[PDB]
Amino acid sequence: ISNYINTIPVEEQPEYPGNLELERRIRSAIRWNAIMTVLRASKKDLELGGHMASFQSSATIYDVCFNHFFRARNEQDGGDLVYFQGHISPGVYARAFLEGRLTQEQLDNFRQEVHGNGLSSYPHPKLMPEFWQFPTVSMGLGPIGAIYQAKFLKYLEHRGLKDTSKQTVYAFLGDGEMDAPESKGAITIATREKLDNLVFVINCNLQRLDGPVTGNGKIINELEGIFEGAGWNVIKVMWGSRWDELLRKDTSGKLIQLMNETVDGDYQTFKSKDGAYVREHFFGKYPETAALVADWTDEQIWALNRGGHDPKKIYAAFKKAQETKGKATVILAHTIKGYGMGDAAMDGVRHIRDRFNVPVSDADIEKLPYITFPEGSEEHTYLHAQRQKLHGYLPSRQPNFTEKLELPSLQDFGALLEEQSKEISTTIAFVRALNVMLKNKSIKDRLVPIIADEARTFGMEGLFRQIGIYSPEDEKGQILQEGINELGAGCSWLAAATSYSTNNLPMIPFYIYYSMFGFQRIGDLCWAAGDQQARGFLIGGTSGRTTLNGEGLQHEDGHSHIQSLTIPNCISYDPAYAYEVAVIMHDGLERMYGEKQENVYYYITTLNENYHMPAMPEGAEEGIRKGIYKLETIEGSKGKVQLLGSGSILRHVREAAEILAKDYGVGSDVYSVTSFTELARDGQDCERWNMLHPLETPRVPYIAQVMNDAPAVASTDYMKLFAEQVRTYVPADDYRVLGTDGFGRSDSRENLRHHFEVDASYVVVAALGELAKRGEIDKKVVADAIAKFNIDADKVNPRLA
Amino acid sequence: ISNYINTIPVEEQPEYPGNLELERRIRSAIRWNAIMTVLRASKKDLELGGHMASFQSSATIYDVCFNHFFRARNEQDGGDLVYFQGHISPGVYARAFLEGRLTQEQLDNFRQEVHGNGLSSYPHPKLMPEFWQFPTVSMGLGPIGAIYQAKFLKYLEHRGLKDTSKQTVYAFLGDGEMDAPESKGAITIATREKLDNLVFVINCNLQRLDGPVTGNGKIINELEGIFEGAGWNVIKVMWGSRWDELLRKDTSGKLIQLMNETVDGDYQTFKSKDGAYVREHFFGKYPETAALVADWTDEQIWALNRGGHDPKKIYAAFKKAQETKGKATVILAHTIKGYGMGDAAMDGVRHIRDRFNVPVSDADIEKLPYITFPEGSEEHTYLHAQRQKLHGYLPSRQPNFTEKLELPSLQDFGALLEEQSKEISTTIAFVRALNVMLKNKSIKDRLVPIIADEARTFGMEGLFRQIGIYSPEDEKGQILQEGINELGAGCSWLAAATSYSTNNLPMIPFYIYYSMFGFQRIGDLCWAAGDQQARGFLIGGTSGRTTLNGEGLQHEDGHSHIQSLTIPNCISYDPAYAYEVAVIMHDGLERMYGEKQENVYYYITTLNENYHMPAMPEGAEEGIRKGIYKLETIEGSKGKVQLLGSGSILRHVREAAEILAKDYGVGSDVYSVTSFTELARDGQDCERWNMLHPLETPRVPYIAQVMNDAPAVASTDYMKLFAEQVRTYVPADDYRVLGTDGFGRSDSRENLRHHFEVDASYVVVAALGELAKRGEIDKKVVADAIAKFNIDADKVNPRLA
């Protein structure tokens, strides 16, 4: 680390280009409206919430940026991409209001958006589709999301898809937020990728929410040390302009020594006392430092401020960051939390009114009025002139992309709809589907294949020589290889899946990884992706509890689908055949990037197990998209059942169908369930609608339009709940579900499918059991089947194993 | 960053204390047996998998540790806590086999454990309770887990609970793994806490899985840079002993320069060529770097090895790490990937046998035999001699603690079982329950409250005064304040929740945080916690989609219970009342830390909403623990329904019962469901048993014993699936579920409960709907209820809003 002073000395500091006095009047009005918005919300006494102290500490930092740096979306590019610190939203709304982009009625509806004309608590594009762009309130995601957004912008330029050289990514972070592993865990990537189009602005007010970040330490030195060691350009903005005289005349170096040795805890104590106290405990530590302010009054000493509140020091930092190349820059802005709010941090708000010279009658304070600048006023003119120079207003968002893509038709995937020559897997099918898309002139170069180190495990080796690996294996490479870093790969996926909005340049990402390390490991990011309206594909490879048989407990995924169904705009599928993978990918491509432009993303689990891939049944396309279709009906005069399967288990369910017919004379209807989740949601929607329209023609759940009423059995490679979720909509009185509940373990696929009780043997027993209960066959038959199949009726429940 | 040479120069290198020749004979046998184990598995052609190259590159590092450093569990402490790199498992098994702790039959069942006498693919305590200790295969979790384990050990010492001063925590990592954000994301914490009982060992073989970590750079320099920047003591083990005389002879320092300028890509090139290619491209880079290897034969040059393969260099690194104080130490060990395997990473087997002078004859080689050292042999004597001087063998694990605790009885929670004067929340009930435990002599000091910055939000501040905050507010503080770091807090919780096994010292942790940032954010650690047999409590505060009303989309949790039900050994509850909280916590304590010592952990969601807390009905104990109990029955002659509710929504379900009786003469049975998940699991266990015992009387799900067959409606603050999961077990033919599917948004609780269609008015309408559908009432009564309650029948579906 370096001395606890500004990185940029006054001598190298550029002249401030703006009208400081005018900007302060405008800024004071914004601080005011921000506070009023939150206080009005508090007055309603509805537990609405909202913060004020945070924006107060960073208001000047943002003000300098809005006046001289942030470029808004324009005809050439999406402008600067600003990841606003989540809880300072009231400050963004206040400025928007003054710019005339929001009404008073909207500020009055802060945190009350159910009725349509309110404002979200935090930046949520899903709720405010034309205003916010990036979800940042979940601490940690913003910084890593920003790093990969910056890398993605360079990717677009290097690929020759769009000149993004005029765009900068700004990430506004708190110092307490930096403790989240995601916040610093990927800062080395910025150095590897030379992201000089990235700027981290860390508001260092030395405090978390409940207390100091490191009371007996110096968080600023800690941050400087690690970012410096990571190869970043660190710019510290420590002290305001009043300190310049002091640091300049102290030829003893004692003041610096004092600033260096004083810890975060003591600095916080000062900002709760007064001038006299600072003179005694701070400057009074050494005779040399005591002499520097001897001729100063207590008031003059109390005026000394931290750098993050001085427009001149702030400007210098951002300007230098804008000139730095070959690496990312992080600005450490020293501020005071609860700035100008007094001890606090009706009438008690007249303190801030006087502190910031707010032009509001001390008679109207009770009314908590909003301040506005009339058209023609000096303030109004200035406010708009500075923004026009920067191409308009920010934040803003375009919900749809403008261009028309010529997507491939289902027929282009024709080869995958036919019976396959060799035994392949759904993952191999996925790769072949990707190849078809890579032949489409319209979207071939808009495709963004993303992988988490493991590429050989997914047979992606072929695409390598074909489209190359992005490596600024060169700068024209198309595939993003992020190594052992699912969160990083996920953030790359997110930047690509939202490029249609951010840069009005639709890109179509396909991120394939070990399904177990999907939602379970980066679920918080998947939730934010939905909020950000991500349109892309998440491919969970090596999925299924019993399919990735040798890997064991931390790799065998039998629940990612349970996690994915919790995300509203995520459409999940678990196909068993190659032709289903084709119809699904094609449909998803059409829904998200076709004229419909549906705001959803897809999650498709694929397998690493090879088996026979039959041809798609004529007319099954729509059923595949809806979640279920009938594969075949097998004759049998001793009984009749329904058998459902998905993923790798479907082949075993079909095996059971044959066993039931040839050994027991039991006939059956076999169905391939491509999506239990979409069928469950369709059913929930139908039942909701019918309940609200009791007098009208009821809607029938899709699954009830496919299945009949004979006893049913379902088996999958996931936990029982995956198939049980449609119980309510299944038109049969008997519905037994087999699943892989329990921790995985290492063994052969055969042994695991027997252990998890989902193989053909268990399907037969479950089906016979249902028939026996209906008196259609003797219970002894079921008991003998259990014996014949060597089933241990008394082994421990797999869930407890 | 320092020069690309060893940190410890030969002049400061301690004398190696062991028999190099003999240790190598032992090591070669371990290398051989590890390889045989994987090869034999492969021959089965069951896609079992397993690695070899990784252990080959790091065997010498682990060998030095086993011979001179690793302390085994003993009478004083749990010994050294080693987080073994998961993929080197075959090497640990090979050694255990040689030490006579594993049989040949077990080795032959490598990756085949369904039948009971096999070995897990990776370290999984759940699968091998007396062998493995820490789950490490999920990349990234190992390093952050180890940091907090080391922190926890200091805590135990500072709190006077146990002297852990002789324990060292070792985390063995791969360089590719360091890319995981969690790997380096928390390293500054080790510095803040001066964790001199922690050692990171990074195997830098320059390659991850599908290529190098950073071919165009120097991964070792990147790692040194960020770890040095984070305040760690970095020890680089770059070159073997053969280089010493050379480097010493080097006067122009040109050799140093040569090494510094060469990047990972180059080094991996020489790593494949030959002794001649090296004197040309490497030593032939500069004239001065030629005279050094002039009097050297191509064979002598090709002999130059990397430091990670030199026991003398490795020993010096660990010795220095062992003596270092004030901070953590990281050892960067330079090795060769697929070391000694030449061919790959029968001729192949013969090759390795000759390379390591393995004592296997040509006549036995095709049998892929394991090697053993008979008692009395030199190897057998030394192997066991070294371990005995180090207190025994490891890894080893003790599944149950020996001590007997005197747990508080339910009566000790008496005040919580009675009606409350003041309106409070389930979170307030939780804090009071904790205070009761803090008055119990036997466990008061064993409790470990854990928080992530936010404390006042959960009303915990009342405790900070009593037990204090751990801060080496002092070293005796009992509460762990981890700041904005859910993952870090989760790791501290894990270290404490498994202390009963690791240090034979049961500790009872309670980690409270915003439920949204629970499984969704650290789900991979929660899965690992179940594998590690964690026993403790996870408290999801501010839960429920409509209850954390002002925060919005990324805070409103209506799905954490869907994520938690995927973890086999996690018991989940969503209580509505304070007495339910008391009963649940008491039972959890008894089960996990009483005589039963059950290996499960608890997840309990609590609320921030205050309301009337009634008294616990007499005899409701069993029901509360099971998941459901009948609260009351309300008379009605025009019909009868069953109403189920949980969490904050129960209050509204009871309100609906009143309206149904008063306004429509419809009576009902009202139930409080404390856990839909335990109920669903119970139901699944019964149906499974019934399916497997067709000749026996069907067992009845507990929920079916409590409920009757009248139409039922269920409503919760979570998505519909949470209540729908018990559909198959509910005795009624009609079961309607209301839930909070869809993205959250900001507003009053009233508007959100109406928006998500879960409030009183919707429960009433759902109930009436089932009655009308059955014929008990006219449809028009439903249509008018919808009008009367001002319900918008055409409002968009909340899941889509």
Ligand SMILES: Cc1ncc(C[n+]2csc(CCOP(=O)(O)OP(=O)(O)O)c2C)c(N)n1
């Ligand atoms: C993952 C996550 N955990 C916790 C919170 C709750 N939270 C909101 S603000 C805050 C503290 C912010 O501190 P800091 O980052 O230092 O910013 P400041 O407000 O001081 O500028 C916390 C913990 C959150 N939003 N996300």
Ligand SMILES: Cc1ncc(C[n+]2csc(CCOP(=O)(O)OP(=O)(O)O)c2C)c(N)n1
């Ligand atoms: C979270 C997670 N992602 C991916 C994997 C798959 N994986 C297994 S080994 C490996 C690479 C190992 O490379 P490194 O850490 O450098 O160690 P080495 O084996 O080379 O010694 C990967 C990505 C995993 N186990 N966990």
Ligand SMILES: [Mg+2]
């Ligand atoms: Mg802060």
Ligand SMILES: [Mg+2]
């Ligand atoms: Mg490696």
